Amino acid sequence: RTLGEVWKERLNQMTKEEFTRYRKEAIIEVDRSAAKHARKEGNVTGGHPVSRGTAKLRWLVERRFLEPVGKVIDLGCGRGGWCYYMATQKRVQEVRGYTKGGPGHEEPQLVQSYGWNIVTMKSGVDVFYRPSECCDTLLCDIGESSSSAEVEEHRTIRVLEMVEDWLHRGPREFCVKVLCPYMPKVIEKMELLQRRYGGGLVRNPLSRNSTHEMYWVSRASGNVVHSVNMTSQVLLGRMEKRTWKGPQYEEDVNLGSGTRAV
Numbered sequence: 001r002t003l004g005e006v007w008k009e010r011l012n013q014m015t016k017e018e019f020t021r022y023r024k025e026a027i028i029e030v031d032r033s034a035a036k037h038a039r040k041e042g043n044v045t046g047g048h049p050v051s052r053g054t055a056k057l058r059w060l061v062e063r064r065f066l067e068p069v070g071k072v073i074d075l076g077c078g079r080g081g082w083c084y085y086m087a088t089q090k091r092v093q094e095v096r097g098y099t100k101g102g103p104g105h106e107e108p109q110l111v112q113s114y115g116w117n118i119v120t121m122k123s124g125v126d127v128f129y130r131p132s133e134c135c136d137t138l139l140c141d142i143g144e145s146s147s148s149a150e151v152e153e154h155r156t157i158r159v160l161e162m163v164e165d166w167l168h169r170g171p172r173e174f175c176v177k178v179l180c181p182y183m184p185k186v187i188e189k190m191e192l193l194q195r196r197y198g199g200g201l202v203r204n205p206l207s208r209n210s211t212h213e214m215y216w217v218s219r220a221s222g223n224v225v226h227s228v229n230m231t232s233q234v235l236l237g238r239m240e241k242r243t244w245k246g247p248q249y250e251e252d253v254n255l256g257s258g259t260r261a262v
């Protein structure tokens with residue numbers, strides 16, 4: 001049994017109240033309050049991000065785990081927090097996103113933060129059937145969670161196979177969400193995917209403890225197994241913390257407004 005597995009066995013035996021407590025413990029969280037009430041007054045020029053997403057992506061680019069350049073393609077962009085954010089990046093001159101859409105899933109939200117003009121979001125597109133395009137930096141935040149790990153291991157290997165095909169950039173940029181990185185199939189796939197496209201797994205501190213996801217980013221490295229086991233330790237440790245502090249709230253990002261020339 002991998003340490004990630006005991007982590008799932010444990011998680012699933014918790015209660016609603018202990019569950020809801022565990023997930024947001026000691027993690028970093030942004031204050032959505034402002035954006036929430038900006039949406040109501042129909043304020044699409046406040047510079048407010050459309051989701052908790054953008055903030056997650058920023059934390060990553062800001063540590064230099066990647067450097068978004070040229071045409072940007074986003075897989076499963078939902079509201080568009082990764083797209084609106086990229087449109088505020090120096091070397092990015094076009095953002096394109098694709099999402100499921102339809103009942104149950106989100107629909108891209110059209111706002112006017114800094115650079116919106118450069119982004120095009122198309123909904124009603126199931127990425128697992130869509131043939132590949134050319135992009136300088138690719139992104140993907142897909143991974144439908146389940147109470148079963150065998151199931152996560154699959155939905156992941158699928159995504160990974162869906163990604164490797166879009167991977168025909170050059171010494172390019174990418175950030176891809178890995179739903180279940182602890183099951184052997186995903187570790188064998190990663191190990192190999194690493195040998196071809198470099199990069200590495202990264203646990204994003206903005207994630208909730210109720211998920212073992214990690215981000216394979218082009219500008220990172222490190223023995224995969226090692227990378228995923230360290231995290232498991234963390235998630236396992238946050239369950240037995242005698243003293244419980246809630247989540248730490250950092251300020252939510254502000255993209256600005258207006259358009260970017262030409």
Ligand SMILES: Nc1ncnc2c1ncn2[C@@H]1O[C@H](CSCC[C@H](N)C(=O)O)[C@@H](O)[C@H]1O
Nearest residue numbers: 053076078079080081082099100105127141
């Ligand atoms: N096959 C598929 N194709 C496209 N999007 C998919 C998909 N399966 C799941 N998704 C999408 O996965 C998204 C994960 S949420 C990602 C949120 C995004 N970074 C933001 O900032 O808003 C959901 O919005 C869902 O619609």
